[PDB]
Amino acid sequence: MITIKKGLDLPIAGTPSQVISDGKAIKKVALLGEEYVGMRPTMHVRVGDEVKKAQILFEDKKNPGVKFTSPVSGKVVEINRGAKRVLQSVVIEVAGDDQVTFDKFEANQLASLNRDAIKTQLVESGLWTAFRTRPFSKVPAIDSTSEAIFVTAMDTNPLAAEPTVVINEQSEAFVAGLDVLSALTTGKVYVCKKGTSLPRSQQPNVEEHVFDGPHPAGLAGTHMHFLYPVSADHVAWSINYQDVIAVGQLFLTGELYTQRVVSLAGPVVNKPRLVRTVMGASLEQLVDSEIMPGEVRIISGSVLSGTKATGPHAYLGRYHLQVSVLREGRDKELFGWAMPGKNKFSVTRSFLGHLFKGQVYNMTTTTNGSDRSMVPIGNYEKVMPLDMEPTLLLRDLCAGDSDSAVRLGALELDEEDLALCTFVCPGKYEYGQLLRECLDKIEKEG
Amino acid sequence: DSIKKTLFVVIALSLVCSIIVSAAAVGLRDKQKENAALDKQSKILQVAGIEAKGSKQIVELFNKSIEPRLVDFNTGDFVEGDAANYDQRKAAKEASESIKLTAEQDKAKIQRRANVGVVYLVKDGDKTSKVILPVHGNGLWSMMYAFVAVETDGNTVSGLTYYEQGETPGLGGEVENPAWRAQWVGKKLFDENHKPAIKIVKGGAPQGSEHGVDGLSGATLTSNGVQNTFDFWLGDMGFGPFLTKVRDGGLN
Amino acid sequence: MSTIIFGVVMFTLIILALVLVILFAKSKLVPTGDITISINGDPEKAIVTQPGGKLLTALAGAGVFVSSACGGGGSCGQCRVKIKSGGGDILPTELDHISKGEAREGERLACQVAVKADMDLELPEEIFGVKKWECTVISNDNKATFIKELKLAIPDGESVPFRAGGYIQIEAPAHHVKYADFDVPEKYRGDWDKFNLFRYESKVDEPIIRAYSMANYPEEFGIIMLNVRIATPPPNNPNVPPGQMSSYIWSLKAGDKCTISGPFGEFFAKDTDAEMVFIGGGAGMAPMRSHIFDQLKRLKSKRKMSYWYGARSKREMFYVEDFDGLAAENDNFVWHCALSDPQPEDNWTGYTGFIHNVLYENYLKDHEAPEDCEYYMCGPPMMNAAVINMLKNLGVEEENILLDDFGG
Amino acid sequence: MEHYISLLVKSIFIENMALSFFLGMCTFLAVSKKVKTSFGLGIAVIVVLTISVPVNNLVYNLVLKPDALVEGVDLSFLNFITFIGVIAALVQILEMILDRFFPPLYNALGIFLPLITVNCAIFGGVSFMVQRDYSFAESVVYGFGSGVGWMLAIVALAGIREKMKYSDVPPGLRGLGITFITAGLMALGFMSFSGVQL
Amino acid sequence: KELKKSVLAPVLDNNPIALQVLGVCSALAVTTKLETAFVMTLAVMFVTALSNFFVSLIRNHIPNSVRIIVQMAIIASLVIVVDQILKAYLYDISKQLSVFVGLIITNCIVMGRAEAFAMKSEPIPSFIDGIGNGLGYGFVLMTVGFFRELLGSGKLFGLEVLPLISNGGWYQPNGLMLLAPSAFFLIGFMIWAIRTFKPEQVEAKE
Amino acid sequence: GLKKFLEDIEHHFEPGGKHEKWFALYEAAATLFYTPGLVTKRSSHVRDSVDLKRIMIMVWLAVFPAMFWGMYNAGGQAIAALNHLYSGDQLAAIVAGNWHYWLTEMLGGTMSSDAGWGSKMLLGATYFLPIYATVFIVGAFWEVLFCMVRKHEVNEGFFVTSILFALIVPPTLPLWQAALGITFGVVVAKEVFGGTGRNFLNPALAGRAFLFFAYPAQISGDLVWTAADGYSGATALSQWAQGGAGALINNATGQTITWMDAFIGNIPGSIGEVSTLALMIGAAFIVYMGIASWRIIGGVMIGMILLSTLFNVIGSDTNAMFNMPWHWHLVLGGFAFGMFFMATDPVSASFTNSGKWAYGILIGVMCVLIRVVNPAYPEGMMLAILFANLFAPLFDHVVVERNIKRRLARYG
Ligand SMILES: Cc1cc2nc3c(=O)[nH]c(=O)nc-3n(C[C@H](O)[C@H](O)[C@H](O)COP(=O)(O)OP(=O)(O)OC[C@H]3O[C@@H](n4cnc5c(N)ncnc54)[C@H](O)[C@@H]3O)c2cc1C
Ligand code: FES
Ligand SMILES: [Ca+2]
């Protein structure tokens, strides 16, 4: 058992009710091309083409053999491209239920399958993109293995869903996915969770680890840092509970399981709750008549690390399990910086808000101030639980000293690991993009 | 790049440079001694009230303005009279005569003293018209003369004649004097009762009265020897009972 | 007086003792013995060298030759060699060309490695087939107002085992040449007369080496064709001395003798199926002709191909017959030419402007997937930069843009 | 006991070779951008100084001092050239060691590795030893302390410059000008020992 | 011809202190007085010129192992003979030189130019290079000395141009101009001005 | 309204306007009066409420009790000394010859021996306010000049530097000297390095060091700490060095200086340093809010106590400074002011929790050492802080290298 003591449980309004209900009927899905790290697509379809479920849409130039397949059966209606012809989404309009089928195995045959057969089935089905490698958070090359696969059976993000409610419906699929992963790994499988009970695999090399504390107690970066530190020559893989259920369903039935149970929540949602949806569902149709009037921002994922869902990007991400909606803070206040903040949240104690314990805030998308230099009053140390030097690592990230940042521990990090650091910066910096730039430089350098 | 070539070129260059350096160093030694004698005589005479402005007039100004005389420096008696050009440090090289590890060791940090000290009473015609006496101590090599006014010892101005060289031309804080442009006139730090004292005051008073040494700003460091090299003026070791013999009689 | 003797003798003794100590320390702090540069772990090819100098000099004197674009100046970065055993650190003059990923494998610039101890290398590509030849000039007829076609007769009727896109370094002795020796025809002279370029001259006092690309493809046995442009001083400063080596090459006539170095090169085609697009301009027609002729006449590949060439005017076009024949005979190959500055007597009716503008506004703008093709480039640096920028704006990735220029 | 600790502390802090006497400034300002190389330069300077000072002490006391060899024979004018010859031989052996064992430190020094000979700190230490008339043990302690103080100053400057990776210096001031200003600020920082009579 | 070009280049284009780093210690030390700055400038110029000449005369015979010994023997002999002759005859200025004979030997410009130019050039061009480096060094020395002496004592070359409150004027001297931090700041700002008027000397972003 | 005004004259300061060079000043004024009204664009779509404006406004508000007590104390000390020296007609002639005194008497106050707290604070204000105004204007000139030339935007930090510099000078400092000091501190120590958040030295203590070493007679001695005409008097740190605890006596009133007097602030000195009580009340608020570092403050206290107790244990026969205890070291000089408001500068301190302890311990040790064993300076807080500003990055280096070794051992 590991207890995290440095962190922040963000008190934003509109937490969902942990009861599952069916969602709005969805007529369009898409695969967003900019959310895959180090990916350059080779198109296999074009507008007007009719596809089937698990039919390949495009491949990767930089990762030979990786296939990105269609969540549902329908017709390709849009291929969205932006500046310098960068792929933004391949939108499919649902029609029919044709699909591509695979092999099905019994429940007890999964733990002893061949690793190459497992890899072949995953790559062909397109479920191989559920994995991500630390460092660099990329899809694993189809000719590589790892000694550790980390399963994320917990969720500490603001307004996140409870994995227990979802897993308890699909215990057999979860356990089958765990068996498949145990046969797939060369070392062990780490199931990182809370203190509640989950369905358990009987394989000796599948081990459940319990983490306590506030956010980020539920991040794969924290789990790797505490159980299997990653470096250039030690690489770990990550996957979450919904994708493990999908793996189990695929190997038990021979069909791609594209269902999702996401959380619809936010300060401007009338009835926050959990809704059943489909992979890459259209968010403008998912949130149709679910929110209060006004100008709002719909976010695919958390507010700490999510993707703004507007225009061609208004679809559910591959690695996102919630939708966050909140208002737009474009108001201007007279001497607003000097007011006593009874309704203002801060990790410091310069406002009256912290004296009301349990208070819940109707947060918006405001930047409470302007961009400035770094004056280190010691806020990053309150939110970084890892064994690193936050201020110094952030200053190398800002200055662009990639060689020094690698020594200081950048290879262990993802954009979601610096979300609270971006949160509590008085200089209004944004460290996820700086970390991504440094990691891109390290990758390209060799 | 071979041993023979290396050794030959090294030896040749060493000989060629060393012979020139030795010639230019020791072959001028007598001339350097004459230069030192001139810059001692003229330097002391210019404040002695006689305008001995170099070899253009030294031939008619030296030995026609002063006469040699030397004393014990501890009993107030003459023992011989060769002190026309005499330095006490040159005669103190014989061990540590009369000992210098006594209470005044602060000024006597050199721990070396001849049994005879230099004196200069400007007694060309055997009359004591003016008096000058040297100080000589460690702490930035403080070794100086003083003339002061008629009240205790002499007359007019001294400016603390420097013997040969000041440590720096102005690099750092060190005021033994403002070079030769001293603010001195009728200075007074001695006592007629064997009890003088001196500290860091300056500030307007020294232009006539007393206490004209600062020596630095912010350290009091490389002038501490200068400001402490007059605490030795309690007599006995310093020209004996001379400073109660000032303007008294006899030697006067 | 005796003080002088004492000073001299004591100084000399002290200095001699110091120098003797220095020599004693050096005796045990330098190896002073010879070393062996083993190559691919072979008992032969092992080179015994005096422990000093740069690795390139020892390699050249030992009979193993590598790229010398800068000629040992270390500003080229083309002499990369794989070092396995101890060879020291990687000098900062190398970090500008070798990245860390291949710096781990041992790739180093031979211009900077000084041989101090024994070490092991790994020569790549089996370059041991490089050999010097004393060639014979066959013809030197002009092809453009500033470009000439040169044919080389290899001695003893040999044939270079070269790949399309390879290059050779020509070397010349000391000489002094006048531009009056040139034999440009009158219909090309209509510009040389008005610029009075015959008065120019160049001289050579010590031998030099310059690398040139070859315009022939492997089924052209026994000969080596080159396209050479005269290195005239820039028009803004006519007084500047002209290009020595280009002046030398422009002066030779049939029956003369010249010496080449050997077959090198890295600008080779890719072994995929995808579409092929070739972009050449001015004097860059040599590697393009090599590549297209190798692809079509020898390989008989069915890949889709396209060649876009940009000449200054109708006066500067050449190999038109060969490319027209290839385009007519092959349905896969299609040819286009764009004149930057057409003139009234040219009476041109085709595309004008820059070749990259023509290519974009005719072919790549309406293309289904411009990022799936392979682009090969050779020409002026301004055209290279403009075409690279245009291709980058279309989402084309770097590993699909193959570029060979005139010296990196 | 107390005498030698007083001497060591004085040399390191009260009379600092770099930020109190201001000697060694050329290489102090040039080679102080990385702590990794500044540490090696400091160690090399420590070795050179602590070996050169006592050797010159012996040479002065046994050869060049007046009346040290023969009565009346004074050789006190060979002082500078003898001292610089000893320092140059030591630096020659040091270069021989460095070119073989530490190529990364041979580089990033380049033209300054021979100029360790004309580092003003070494010659100033030897001249101060002659002036103060230390003994052999005091010479060893004084040389070691002076080298340690110079290393401390150069490593402090290297750390400051490494921290300045986040600064935004005007283009005409980056490098030498800002290094001069930084050293002038460090001198003001070190001015707090000025009045100590240790 | 090339003579004026070569003597005037190191003044502003290849300045020993402003573009190289050589002579900084003496530049900090002797710039509280214009007379001392002038004397030091002349001494360094003369010594560097003669040392370059004498080193270049025998550049083909110096072994690599004893090169520093040979160079410093020549330089030290030159400086010592200069000091001896100055003491013998020019006693007046030799007294205000005094403790400064030592820094001339260990001045970085002398041996740096001997290493970089004298060992691969001709005698007369080496002499010209020494004179040019002396001029470049003196430019910085006298520019700093002007400001330091003026603002610290109201005097130039000893002649009083700003009357002092101590003697009955209107000016209060700045006591930081008599300390080395002021020399540091002045040299930094002069480097700023030089690299602003000649932007080709700006160092690359690192 | 002001809002419609600020949105009406906005075009003049965009490119193409009649005032396109004063855009920095317009933006500064606009964002002072109203919040920017911007939104997040990349990630962490919600942000914290804190910013540099609040960070510096709290620190500026934290020194108000100290500033007001300093004004009152300066006035009262000057009045007491003047009535000690002069009386009757000579007092009238002295008052008529000084504009501070006759303006205090003209604004309704009194300068006699029975003056009140209002008159004392008015007299102290006549000394404090001109210095603060000069400092702010002269420093703002350089800040705005650098921002306009280099196309940055003016930022807070000078808001704190100005008041901290104006609160640590003697009440009798010349205004031209104040202008020179603020110029040096702003330009040399901070602006050439990039501005706020990009220097390594303390700007407020860098101009004070310039004044200290350039014009010593106006910032040291006996004639500068009480603003009375012709009054000479030593202060408590300069009296202990001479005679110990028996030498602490207020000459103007004939009363001994007690520990309660030193703690409350009834002593001469720099304007804002005197009241340890007020400084502690001010510093507690910003330590609670999370702006100042309790690690740094605790380190300073630890070092001070350790060295000041070692000196007491060793003892001396000639130095009366060897027997001053820690509770006396605390309530004299600028120790409390420095430890609470200058040692806690985030940019000049260490960036590591382990390094902050060493930073504070070094500051305290150096302050006590300069106080005791250095006879030139009676106080050493400014020099101690400027000395630790050079070695903070070395503590950071040591901590980081230990962390990197731990990381390489695969346990961190
Ligand atoms: C793989 C490869 C292939 C190549 N293929 C070809 C090819 O097919 N055709 C071809 O022509 N070249 C080719 N080159 C370039 C070739 O190597 C030579 O650079 C070129 O032939 C001219 O060289 P040169 O020595 O005659 O002239 P250089 O003297 O090297 O060039 C100097 C040019 O600048 C002018 N100039 C001289 N001095 C100055 C000065 N001080 N300031 C300003 N201007 C000055 C000269 O008048 C002349 O125009 C190739 C290079 C490589 C590496
Ligand atoms: S002159 Fe260069 S180190 Fe002193
Ligand atoms: Ca004495």
Q: Assess whether A241 and A256 both reside in one domain.
A: yes
- Phi-psi region for residue F73, left (φ > 0), alpha (ψ -120 to 50) or beta? alpha
**Polymer length in residues for chain E:** 206
Same domain, A47 and A163: no
| Nearest residue of F to residue E185, measured between CA atoms | F188
Burial of A322 (0-12, 13-18, 19+ CB in 10 A): buried
Tokens of F48: 């914290």
Q: Are A236 and A224 in contact (CB under 8 A)?
A: yes
Query: Same domain for F6 and F82?
Result: no
H/E stretch holding D148 reads helix D136-163
Using CB atoms, list chains with 3+ pairs below 8 Å to chain C.
Answer: A, B, D, E
Distance from the Cα of D176 to chain F's closest Cα (Å) equals 13
Q: Decide if F289 contacts A350 (C-beta within 8 A).
A: yes
For residue C245, give the DSSP letter: H
Closest chain B C-alpha to D195 CA, distance in angstroms? 4
If asked whether residues A42 and A143 sit together in one domain, one would say no
Q: State the residue for tokens 């003196």.
A: E138
Contact in structure between B113 and B98 (CB atoms under 8 Å): yes
Q: Using an 8 Å Cβ cutoff, are F63 and F167 in contact?
A: yes
Distance C226 CA to ligand 3 centre (A): 94
Residue C91 pairs with which residues in a beta bridge? none
Task: Return the H-helix or E-strand segment holding F164.
Answer: helix F158-166
**Coil, helix or strand at residue C30:** coil
End-to-end CA distance of chain C: 71
Give the method of determination: cryo-EM
Chain F nearest-CA residue for B220: F376
Ligand 2 center–CA C367 separation, angstroms: 67
Tell me phi and psi for residue F76, to 5 degrees: -65, -40
Q: How far apart are CA A415 and CA A433, in angstroms?
A: 7
Instruction: Give the up-direction half-sphere exposure of residue F337: CA atoms within 13 A in the CB hemisphere.
Output: 30
Phi, psi of A366 (to 5 degrees): -75, 150
Is C299 inside a domain boundary? yes
| Contact of E192 with D172, CB cutoff 8 Å | yes
A38 lies in the same domain as A16: no
Distance CA B13, CA E74 (A): 8
What is the DSSP code string of B85-143?
Answer: G--HHHHTTSTTTT-S-SGGGGT-TT----S-EE-B---SSS-----BEEEEETTTTEE
CB A304 within 8 A of CB A420: yes
- Which amino acid, residue F381? M
The answer to whether A249 touches A41, Cβ cutoff 8 Å, is no
The closest residue, in CA terms, to atom 43 on ligand 1 is C240
Return the closest-CA partner of residue F41 out of A158, A329, A379: A329
F252/C134 Cα distance (integer angstroms): 108
Angle at which helices A431-445 and A390-399 cross, to 10°: 70
Q: Which residue of C has its CA nearest to D80?
A: C11
How would you write chain A as a 3-class SS string? CEECCCCCCCCECCCCEEEEEECCCCCEEEECCCCCCCCCEEECCCCCCEECECCEEEEECCCCCCEEECCCCEEEEEEEECCCCCEEEEEEEECCCCECCCCCCCHHHHHHCCHHHHHHHHHHHCHHHHCEEECCCECCCCCCCCCEEEEECCCCCCCCCCHHHHHCCCHHHHHHHHHHHHHHCCCEEEEEECCCCCCCCCCCCEEEEEEECCCCCCCHHHHHHHHCCCCCCCCEEEEEHHHHHHHHHHHHHCCCCCEEEEEEECCCECCCEEEEEECCEEHHHHCCCCECCCCEEEEEECCCCEEECCHHHCECCCCCCEEEEEECCCCCCECHHHCCCCCCCCCCCCCHHHHCCCCCECCCCECCCCCCCCCCCCCHHHCCCCCCCHHHHHHHHHHCCHHHHHHHCHHHCCHHHHHHHHHCCCCCCCHHHHHHHHHHHHHHHC
Fill in the amino acid letter for B156: T
Query: Considering Cα of E131, then E137, then E140, then E143, what sign does the dihedral take?
Result: negative
Q: Do A265 and A307 fall within a single domain?
A: yes
Counting beta carbons within 10 angstroms of the beta carbon of residue A69, is it exposed (0 to 12), middle (13 to 18) or buried (19 or more)? buried
Would you say the CB of residue D120 lies under 6 angstroms from ligand 2? yes
Sign of the torsion angle spanned by Cα atoms B35, B40, B46, B48:
negative
Residue D25 CB less than 6 A away from ligand 2? yes
Interatomic CA distance for residues A18 and A9, integer angstroms:
18
Residue E77, both tokens: 């002999």
If we measure between CA atoms, which residue out of A174, A168, A164 comes closest to residue A194? A164
CA quadruple B65, B68, B71, B76: dihedral sign: negative
- Tell me the Cα Rg of chain E: 19
Check if C133 has its Cβ closer than 6 Å to any atom of ligand 1.
no
Where a domain ends, among C221, C240, C265? C265
Same domain? For A229 and A356 the reply is no
Ordered by start, the domain boundaries in chain E are 4-205
Q: Are A273 and A19 in contact (CB under 8 A)?
A: yes
Q: What is the DSSP letter of C41?
A: T
Angstrom distance (rounded) from CA F309 to CA F256: 25
C155 shares its domain with C196: yes
Which residues 6+ apart lie within 8 Å of A350 measured at CB?
Answer: A341, F50, F54, F55, F58, F289, F290, F291
Chain center to CA of C153: 21
Q: Which residues contact E136 (CB under 8 A, 6 or more apart)?
A: E10, E11, E12, E14, E15, E16, E17
Which among A46, A86, A446 has the least Cβ separation from residue C102?
A446
Tell if the CB–CB gap between B169 and E65 is shorter than 8 Å: no
User: Within a domain: residue F319?
Assistant: yes
Element (H, E) at E96: helix E91-97
Instruction: Determine the Cα angle at E37 with ends E34 and E40, to 5°.
Output: 150
Under a CB-based contact definition with an 8 Å cutoff, are residues A131 and A237 in contact? yes
Contact C242, C233 (CB under 8 A): yes
**Distant-in-sequence, close-in-space partners of B145: CB < 8 Å, separation ≥ 6:** B44, B47, B120, B132, B133, B134, B135, B158, B160, B161
Residue F6: list chain A partners with CB under 8 A. Answer: none
Q: Which of E26, E47, E64, E72 is the best substitution to test chain D (most D C-beta atoms within 10 A)?
A: E72
User: Is A303 within 8 Å of F46 when comparing Cβ atoms?
Assistant: yes
DSSP assignment of C118-180 equals: -EEEE--TTGGG---EEEEEEE--B-SSSEEEEEEE-GGG------TT-EEEEEE-SEEEEGG
- Residue at B13: amino acid letter: L
Separation of CA B136 and ligand 3 centre (Å)? 5
- Point out the ligand nearest to the CA of residue E111: 2
Backbone φ, ψ for residue A93 (5° rounding): -100, 120
What is the CA(C281)–ligand 1 centre distance, in A? 17
Instruction: Tell me how far apart the alpha carbons of residues A263 and A318 are, in angstroms, rounded to a whole number.
Output: 15
Residue A191: phi and psi, rounded to 5, are: -100, 105
Cβ atoms of A93 and A27 within 8 Å: the answer is yes
Domain annotation covers residue C23: no
Same structural domain for residues A38 and A125? no
How many angstroms separate the CA atoms of B69 and C86, rounded?
82
The H or E element spanning position B70 is: strand B70-71
Q: How far apart are CA A16 and CA A302, in angstroms?
A: 13
Identity (one letter) of the amino acid at C290? S
Query: Distance between CA E38 and CA E142 in Å, rounded?
Result: 7
Q: How far apart are CA C106 and CA A256, in angstroms?
A: 47
| A298/A279 Cα distance (integer angstroms) | 17
Residues A263 and A110: beta-carbon distance below 8 Å: no
Comparing CA positions, the residue from E39, E34, E5, E24 lying closest to residue E190 is E24
Q: What's the CA gap between E63 and B157, in Å, rounded?
A: 62
Cβ contact A27:A94 at 8 Å: yes
d(CA C191, CA C232): 13
Closest approach atom of ligand 2 to CA D119: 3
Q: Checking phi first, is residue A152 left (phi over 0); if not, alpha (psi -120 to 50) or beta?
A: beta
Angle at D44 (CA atoms; ends D38, D45), nearest 5 degrees = 90
Alpha-carbon span C370 to C275, nearest angstrom: 10
Please tell me what DSSP assigns to residue D195. Answer: T
Q: Is F245 helix (H, G, I), strand (E, B) or coil?
A: helix
**One domain, residues F65 and F175:** yes
Q: Reduced to 3 states, what is the DSSP secondary structure of residue F393?
A: helix
Name the residue among D167, D170, D196 with its Cβ closest to that of F373.
D196
DSSP state of C346: T
Question: Do A160 and A253 lie in a common domain?
Answer: yes
Indicate whether F48 belongs to any domain.
no
Shared domain check, F180 and F67: yes
Ligand 2 site, residue E20, Cβ cutoff 6 A: no
**Residue from B85, B83, B117, B84 nearest B236 by CA:** B117
Largest pairwise CA distance in chain D: 66
F323 and F241 Cβ atoms separated by less than 8 Å: no
Report the alpha-carbon distance of residue D23 to residue D27 in Å, rounded. Answer: 10
| Collapsed DSSP state (helix, strand, coil) of residue C204 | strand
User: Which tokens in the block code for residue C90?
Assistant: 């990687």
Closest CA to B70 of B113, B114, B117: B117
In chain D, residues with a C-beta closer than 8 Å to the C-beta of A395 are 165-166
Residues F189 and F82 in one domain: yes
Do C136 and C122 fall into the same domain?
no
User: Contact F237/F379 with Cβ under 8 angstroms?
Assistant: yes
What is the Cα–Cα distance from F393 to A101, expressed in whole angstroms? 62
Q: Residues A201, A172: contact at Cβ < 8 Å? A: no
Per CB-CB distance under 8 Å, the chain C contacts of E66 are 19, 22
CB contact under 8 A, F215 and E185: no
Tokens of D97: 């060691």
Cα–Cα dist E151/E132, whole Å: 29
Residue C329 CB partners (closer than 8 Å, separation 6+): none
Q: Report the gap between the CA of E103 and the closest CA in chain D (Å).
A: 7
C227 CA: nearest ligand 1 atom: 8
The residue nearest atom 28 of ligand 1, judged by CA position, is C243
Instruction: Sort strands C47-49 and C35-39 into parallel, antiparallel or unpaired.
Output: antiparallel
The resolution, in angstroms to one decimal, equals 2.9
d(CA A382, CA A9): 12
Distance of CA F67 to the CA centre of its chain: 10
Tokens of C6: 């004492």
Looking at the fold, whether A269 and A138 belong to one and the same domain comes out as yes
C169 touches ligand 1 (CB under 6 Å): no
At F151, the amino acid letter reads K
Size of interface B-F (CB pairs under 8 A): 8
Separation of alpha carbons A239 and A219, rounded Å: 11
Q: Which residues of C173-210 are buried (b: 16+ CB within 10 A; e: fewer)?
A: eeeebebeebebeeebeeebeeeebeebebebeeebeb
Ligand 2: which of E21, E108, E113, E140 to mutate, judged by most atoms within 8 Å of the beta carbon? E108
**Could you tell me if C303 and C275 are in contact, meaning their C-beta atoms sit under 8 angstroms apart?**
yes
Looking at the fold, whether A136 and A182 belong to one and the same domain comes out as yes
Domain boundaries, chain B: 25-251
DSSP structural state of residue C214: B
Cis status of the peptide bond prior to B68, with omega within 30 of 0? no
Q: How many whole angstroms separate alpha carbon D72 and alpha carbon D50?
A: 32
From the CA of D27, give the closest atom in ligand 2: 3
Pick the ligand that lies closest to the CA of residue B114: 3
Structural contact between residues C288 and C307, judged by C-beta atoms closer than 8 angstroms: yes
C139 and C77, same structural domain?
no
F354 vs A429: CA distance, rounded Å: 25
User: What are the helix (H) ranges across F167-289?
Assistant: 175-184, 203-214, 236-243, 259-264, 276-289
Maximum Cα interatomic distance, chain A, rounded to a whole number of Å: 69
Domain count, chain F: 3
Tokens of B41: 């005589």
Burial group, residue D133, by CB count within 10 angstroms (0-12, 13-18, 19+): exposed
**Domain containing F327: what range?**
292-407
Is the CB of E24 inside a 6 Å radius of any atom of ligand 2? yes
Residue C104 belongs to what domain range?
35-129
Same domain for A265 and A145: yes
Rounded CA-CA distance F285/A50 in Å is: 67
Helix (H, G, I), strand (E, B) or coil at F22: coil
Looking only at the bridges linking them, the beta strands covering C147-153 and C133-139 are antiparallel
- Whether A285 and A224 map to the same domain: the answer is yes
Select from C3, C4, C23 the Cβ nearest to the Cβ of B3. C23
Largest CA distance in chain F: 84
Which phi and psi angles does E84 have, rounded to 5°?
A: -65, -45
How crowded is residue A116: how many other Cβ atoms within 10 Å of its Cβ?
A: 8
Q: Are both F1 and F88 inside the same structural domain? A: no
Q: Do the domain assignments include residue C2?
A: no
Q: Which of B226, B231, B232, B205 is nearest to B214 (CA)?
A: B226
Q: Distance (Å, rounded) from C-alpha B102 to C-alpha E44?
A: 47
User: What type of residue sits at position C143?
Assistant: K
